[PDB]
């Protein structure tokens, strides 16, 4: 299936090619609903991302749900960073694992057609 | 007929910030004002990736009652009281101690 080794590969392949002005322009469908400026700083987020993924042992990378409080302490200590960044990175891998399972079960055109952008009420951003 | 108005320099009469001085940022219809550097609250925010706000404890200025602030007369160096008079055809504001126009 999908692992943080496969996310390691997706990430050292994506930190090579990627930019935030070539990625926020290839879509004008979610550059109208979300602010055109909310992309990221790609170099920093993918260098932190590759740092945090590299700090992992091979059994924590191949199986991402065995990572708990002590392991996040240690991933924060080896890459010299915050337990909160490690947290929200295990959370983005959680969502993209969710989405590659939803591309796996349903066809590429049914999981690209039923994808939804939302407003809590129809007024802009509110 | 608003005694305290935007941009005035006020002094805080009451509360933790009593004695302090500052410039009025805006007023709310509740009889409340928001003064600069005054009445600072530490507010926790849950990070919004839509608004590109991080989270955290961020210090913001809280609404304070307008009964609690006085127009500051820099002339007498004290808290003062406003009254309205008719100069030209225009209603204007003046101080009650030395009786001169704002």
């Amino acid at each position: 299936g999908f692992d943080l080794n496969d996310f390691l590969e997706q990430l050292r392949q994506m930190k090579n090619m990627g930019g935030x002005x070539x990625x926020x322009x290839x879509x004008x469908x979610x550059x109208x609903x979300x602010x055109x400026x909310x992309x990221x700083x790609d170099d920093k987020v993918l260098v932190r991302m590759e740092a945090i993924i590299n700090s992992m042992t091979m059994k924590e990378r191949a199986k991402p749900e065995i990572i708990k409080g002590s392991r996040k302490r240690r991933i924060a200590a080896g890459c010299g960073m915050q337990v909160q960044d490690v947290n929200r990175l295990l959370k983005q891998f959680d969502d993209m694992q969710r989405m590659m399972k939803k591309m796996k079960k349903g066809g590429x055109x049914x999981x690209x057609x039923x994808x939804x952008x939302x407003x809590x009420x129809x007024x802009x951003x509110x | 007929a608003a005694k305290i108005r935007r941009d005035d320099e006020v002094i805080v009469l009451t509360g933790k910030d009593k004695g302090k001085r500052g410039k009025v940022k805006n007023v709310l219809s509740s009889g409340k004002v928001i003064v600069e550097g005054i009445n600072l609250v530490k507010k926790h925010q849950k990070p919004v990736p839509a608004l590109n706000q991080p989270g955290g404890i961020v210090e913001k200025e809280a609404a304070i009652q307008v009964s609690n602030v006085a127009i500051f007369n820099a002339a007498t160096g004290k808290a003062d009281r406003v009254g309205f008079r008719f100069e030209d055809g225009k209603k204007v504001r003046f101080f009650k101690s030395n009786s001169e126009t704002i």
Binding site: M14, X27, X30, X34, X38, X39, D95, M96 | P49
Partner: peptide, 18 residues
Amino acid sequence: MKQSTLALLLLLLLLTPV
């Protein structure tokens, strides 16, 4: 291609708004 662009788009992109 098809799964390269559907990966890459939804990845950089849905990394962004959530």
